[PDB]
């Protein structure tokens, strides 16, 4: 593995598809951590919202690369998601992420579902990230 840390724009769907913020992807000694940065800086608070989004351990690293460049699946060790998700407060462990390559306005995105919305039941958030952005950083 050659990458260190990179940043991609991440969109979510609740519709519409909306631009949400940045996803920061970091290779750690054991596995990968992602963090989400959402919204405005201030003085000089970096963003409105900065936190671990999910993480995964070393043994899922090859699944994550394949999933994020070709579509597939990987297991997170820990998933929080964003503030609307039930997981955001307390995390969910061992949640499997399923990725798909889908077209939105003619461009290929990697899409995936997150967790259920905090106080709906069955309704889950969906995320998308430009496929080329991921391929170039994860080769």
| Resolution of the experimentally solved model in angstroms | 2.2
- PDB experimental method: X-ray
Query: Strand pairing partners for 37?
Result: 22, 50
Rounded to 10 degrees, the C-alpha dihedral 28/11/42/25 comes to 10
* Residue ranges per structural domain of the chain: 1-139
**Separation between Cα atoms, residue 100 and residue 114, nearest integer Å:** 13
Hey, is 17 helix, strand or coil? strand
DSSP letters, 51-64, are EEEEEE-GGGHHHH
**Separation between Cα atoms, residue 50 and residue 82, nearest integer Å:** 10
SS (H, E, C) 68-137: HHHCEEEECCEECCCCCECHHHHCEECCEEEEEEEEECCEEEEEEEEEEECCCCCCEEEEEEEHHHHHHH
**Separation between Cα atoms, residue 108 and residue 110, nearest integer Å:** 7
- Multiple choice CATH, 1-139, 1.10.3210.10, 2.30.31.50, 3.30.565.10, 3.40.50.300: 2.30.31.50
């Amino acid at each position: 593995i050659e990458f260190s840390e990179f940043t991609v724009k991440i969109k979510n769907k609740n519709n519409n598809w909306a631009d949400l913020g940045d996803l920061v992807v970091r290779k750690e000694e054991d596995g990968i951590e992602t963090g989400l940065n959402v919204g405005k800086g201030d003085s000089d608070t970096f963003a409105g919202y900065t936190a671990t989004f999910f993480s995964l351990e070393e043994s899922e690293v090859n699944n994550f690369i394949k999933a994020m460049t070709e579509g597939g699946s990987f297991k997170t060790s820990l998933y929080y998601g964003y503030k609307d998700e039930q997981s955001n407060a307390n995390g969910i462990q061992n949640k499997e992420i399923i990725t798909k390559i889908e077209k939105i306005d003619d461009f290929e995105y990697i899409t995936f579902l997150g967790d259920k919305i905090k106080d709906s039941g069955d309704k889950v958030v969906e995320y998308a990230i430009l496929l080329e952005d991921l391929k170039k950083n994860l080769k």
